[PDB]
Each structure stands twice: as C-alpha cells, then as structure tokens.
Amino acid sequence: VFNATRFASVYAWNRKRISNCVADYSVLYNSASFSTFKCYGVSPTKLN
Amino acid sequence: GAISSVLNDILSRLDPPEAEVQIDRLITGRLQSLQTYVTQQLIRAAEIR
Amino acid sequence: DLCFTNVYADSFVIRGDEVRQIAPGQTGKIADYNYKLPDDFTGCVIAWN
C-alpha cells in the first residue's frame, strides 16, 4: 500500500485487512518519505 | 475517566509526558475509595464501643 | 520584575520546518538524534529567518 499504483479518494474508500504476520514499525518513522507521522493512542516508540 | 484500569497497560502504550495524565486520574479515583472505607469503619467502631 | 541566577545560551541552526521540533516533550528527527529538551525545561527559544 505504500508502493501501489493508484489510490482511491474520500468518496470511494479502500479497506485492507492485514493479519497473521510479522511487521516492523521502526522503518516507517526513520525513512525520509513522510512529514506527519503523529499518533493518538499509542506512542510510536512503544509500537514494537 | 482514564483509558484502562491496569497501570501496566498505560505505561506500555503512552509516552511519559502523556502517561502521567491518565495515571493521575486513577490515583485520585482510588484515594477517595480508601477514605470512604476508613470513615465508614470509624462509625462502626463507635457503635461496637 | 522577577529574575533568576543565570541564563544559558545554546545556539544552532535548523531547517525551515524544524522549528516545531525544538519543544519540550515530543520526539522527531532532531529530538531523537541531534538535540532534545527535557520535560521540566523552564525557559524558551526564539527563531529568526
């Protein structure tokens, strides 16, 4: 979903259920690809 | 009024500038529960006296 | 009207969007690798283009 071809809009919403795997939340914050990565309920360091 | 009742659930989710606020809602809510038990038992101790 | 003992003077340069990073409490790119202020930091910074 970061390297996809086409994205949707706010009128037609895309949903993707992801489960049963092993992730890495450290690579989503140090890479210079975004500007706003602020969170609401969970701290970004404690996600791992 | 906090997020959860377990103190281990708030320290392992929140940053300590934010986790202090949810902990402080649990300290005040549990201090008034202890002061009601002591006050209600000081009148029962006078009735049994 | 009031004053303290002594003041400190730390000086560096940043980019245009990193003014928000020098602030007490949160993280970032500068706040994680380069320069971070504590939670009980009394004082303030001033920027100029």
Side-chain angles (χ1 to χ4, degrees):
Chain A
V1 308
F2 319 117
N3 306 323
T5 56
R6 292 298 174 269
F7 283 15
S9 81
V10 305
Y11 164 70
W13 272 76
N14 193 23
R15 321 295 181 170
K16 174 183 180 61
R17 178 186 179 273
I18 304 173
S19 159
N20 293 26
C21 54
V22 167
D24 188 310
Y25 292 94
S26 65
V27 305
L28 309 181
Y29 294 134
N30 65 329
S31 78
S33 158
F34 309 111
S35 87
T36 72
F37 42 84
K38 51 162 291 315
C39 310
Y40 295 111
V42 181
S43 192
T45 312
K46 311 292 183 177
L47 272 160
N48 274 7
Chain B
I3 315 176
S4 87
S5 87
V6 194
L7 280 177
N8 300 331
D9 264 348
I10 322 176
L11 293 170
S12 160
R13 285 182 290 115
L14 266 64
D15 56 75
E18 178 46 42
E20 175 274 349
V21 181
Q22 308 293 325
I23 281 178
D24 204 13
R25 286 189 171 180
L26 281 175
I27 301 178
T28 314
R30 285 173 184 175
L31 269 179
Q32 294 181 347
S33 306
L34 264 178
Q35 286 191 349
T36 314
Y37 173 73
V38 180
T39 307
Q40 263 184 0
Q41 276 210 334
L42 271 170
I43 317 177
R44 294 199 187 105
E47 183 206 340
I48 211 67
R49 182 58 180 176
Chain C
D1 55 354
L2 60 92
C3 43
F4 320 101
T5 78
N6 56 39
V7 285
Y8 274 57
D10 303 359
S11 317
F12 55 81
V13 294
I14 44 154
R15 284 178 284 185
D17 50 347
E18 321 272 1
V19 168
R20 184 233 61 78
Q21 294 223 26
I22 297 95
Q26 68 269 18
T27 44
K29 206 262 170 184
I30 306 308
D32 188 88
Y33 301 104
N34 310 276
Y35 182 77
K36 179 260 300 173
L37 283 176
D39 273 347
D40 43 357
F41 161 69
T42 173
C44 49
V45 301
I46 183 167
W48 208 3
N49 209 329

